[PDB]
């Protein structure tokens, strides 16, 4: 019987930062609403959440990095959609955006929820946008509280 | 040629566990097999900590904070990445493994990679218990191997 | 209604650095013309923009890095085209050039627009050159302003 | 042109070599190591200057080589083992990460690390390459250890 | 319109110090590259007394050599030569990826341009067709980029 930390989905008093990659506009918009309502449903106050926008997923890294450095946020959320087109640009954007999100969380200690879809079709992104947005709100809240522990 | 001999001895070691809950049943089977093997090696139930994160992408931040505290001789990563419909499988598989590798290299804390990267739920089920036990065997040996080399 | 920062596409007073990988020259030149024209439309002064060129995408990293380190530029732009040929060289050039662009922006804090095409055919590069050049101007301007809001 | 051309130096005399062996695929690793030590001695390395360690798998090579490199007790390091494709993407994960760690350690500490980890599709391919790969890693470690010493001061 | 400052390429090797590392595996290919590379370097004005040439067994060993040479800051630019030719195993992908990543990483961290002259092809026949051209190209890249770094050092 080992000491088992229980997940804490209690947004009360957490400061959450959100960055939305706008490309595939309709997809990003659906994610954000599902994310914000779940944040409020989880206990996050509208006054403790900031939302910013970037043209595309490759620009997420520089934005999320600056917010992590401010240390004003307990956790961050990355939103957006990369939809396969005709070229190897899909694999590049998918790899680099995911790696940057991963790297920021590791070096600054600020959890970053990876809500960036990497899909083949608009239909796949539409089916996942709202659900993944809600999941990203849950991941940010739990991982922010998990970060406060272990400190 | 001096040949360091393997040392499989939990014996009072503090081992940290992070479990990605996605594909929950798989993670629980790994954790059950993992703790059982840890005790079989001599790790005290009060000296091993277990933490949970939603998915494999959240392992990096959890394992990282635990490693920096230097409270643990070795770490264990558990969870399962099962191929679905999208390139998300390759992303989660690559980044989760890269973080586990990176935390071990930079911090000196060995991290057993118990994250399955499989194509089907059936493959994860066939391997869950075996890989959980192996991560206990790797975590114990690598914690001890660090001491002979520190 | 959470505080929602709105995009700022106002180039006025911004200093932009541009690095153009010349291999597949016609594509790089089309991107540069579309990029500069869009920069001016956003309010960037022609006297505040520097343009340098390198033989290929693998040489972008070292040039962009020195420009970022000088901290003379609010944002940087990488232009060029990697077109699949006969060998794994395509995957190597595409991966490493993109990875360096990401790493420079992450570590120095200066946004770098990734305008390097990674395509299979010359026709694909031609169809995308002008749009990607102009898009890189919009990304550089917007992200330079976005960085300023978080700098203090 | 007649530029100065540094010539390879394959004179192990007095070199201290560290070895880390991934035990998974047992027969492959020892066949590599026996071939490796035999070639090291043929190159002039004394048996008293070589240390040998074992790890469960290739993914644990990185942390072990890292502790040895940080000590700066070794002129060059060698990583041995075999990754044989099975049924899952695990083959690519182990192959990529283990090689990347070997690469990163050599760059950051300046201590060359010979990459002796095979990445093959079948046991038969691993067997065909095991013996040659042990010897090749000895020639790489000795030569690259001396090349670091030249470029040193 | 927009007529910004356009720094123009400088292909004048005169007074540049170039370091070269040649991965010997596939000997004939690497040597064909080196001769084409030295011949082009001299054509650009680089003195044979300002060029150093070193050797490594393979591309996986390029990184550690190039890194030590770059740290000395005795060289205005570096060149990596060699060939990785696909065989029977995933070793081709590993060697191609890691050697290229190290070459890229050294240029970023030290500021010393490193020309990637490592071919990554499927057949010896492709390597033969490219050896001389890439050797000459790495001479032009090293010279031009050495001068471009100097223009940005101020
Ligand atoms: Cl950072
Ligand atoms: Cl807009
Ligand atoms: Cl940098
Ligand atoms: Cl290190
Ligand atoms: Cl030219
Ligand atoms: Cl370095």
């Amino acid at each position: 019987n080992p000491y088992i930390l229980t997940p804490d989905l209690n947004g009360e008093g957490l400061h959450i930062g959100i960055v939305r990659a706008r490309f595939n506009e309709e997809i990003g918009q659906a994610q954000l609403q599902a994310c914000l309502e779940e944040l409020g449903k989880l206990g996050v106050d509208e006054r403790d959440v900031m939302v910013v926008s970037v043209p595309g997923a490759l620009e997420l890294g520089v934005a999320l990095a600056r917010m992590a450095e401010s240390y004003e946020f307990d956790a961050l959320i990355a939103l957006g959609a990369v939809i396969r087109g005709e070229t190897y640009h899909f694999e590049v954007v998918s790899n680099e955006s995911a790696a940057a999100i991963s790297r920021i969380a590791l070096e600054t200690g600020i959890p970053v929820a990876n809500g960036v879809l990497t899909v083949d079709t608009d239909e796949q992104a539409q089916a996942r946008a709202a659900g993944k947005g809600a999941d990203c709100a849950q991941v940010a809240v739990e991982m922010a509280n998990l970060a406060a522990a272990l400190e």
Side-chain angles (χ1 to χ4, degrees), chain A residues 2 4-5 7-8 11 13-25 27-40 43 48-65 67-68 70-71 73-134 136-150:
Chain A
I4 280 179
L5 187 32
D8 189 322
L14 289 176
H15 303 269
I16 293 325
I18 287 174
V19 187
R20 187 186 120 257
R22 293 193 305 273
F23 204 63
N24 303 310
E25 296 291 329
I27 304 298
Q29 288 182 359
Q31 297 189 52
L32 188 57
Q33 178 279 335
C35 184
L36 295 170
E37 183 178 352
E38 185 69 8
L39 276 176
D48 286 13
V49 171
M50 183 179 14
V51 169
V52 309
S53 182
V54 296
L58 287 178
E59 296 80 33
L60 283 161
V62 76
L64 295 164
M67 298 190 199
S70 84
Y71 273 108
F73 302 103
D74 304 305
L76 300 179
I77 290 171
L79 302 179
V82 187
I83 305 183
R84 189 187 290 281
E86 304 164 25
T87 75
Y88 191 73
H89 196 248
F90 171 81
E91 277 98 345
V92 173
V93 175
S94 298
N95 294 331
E96 290 309 314
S97 68
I101 294 165
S102 168
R103 189 186 182 193
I104 296 172
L106 220 74
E107 288 156 9
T108 76
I110 313 314
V112 188
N114 189 344
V116 179
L117 300 162
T118 55
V119 308
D120 288 334
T121 65
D122 300 328
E123 293 82 5
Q124 278 170 344
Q126 295 163 3
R128 297 162 166 73
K132 190 58 173 171
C136 288
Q138 296 181 23
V139 177
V141 163
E142 166 176 9
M143 298 293 328
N145 292 339
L146 202 293
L150 302 166

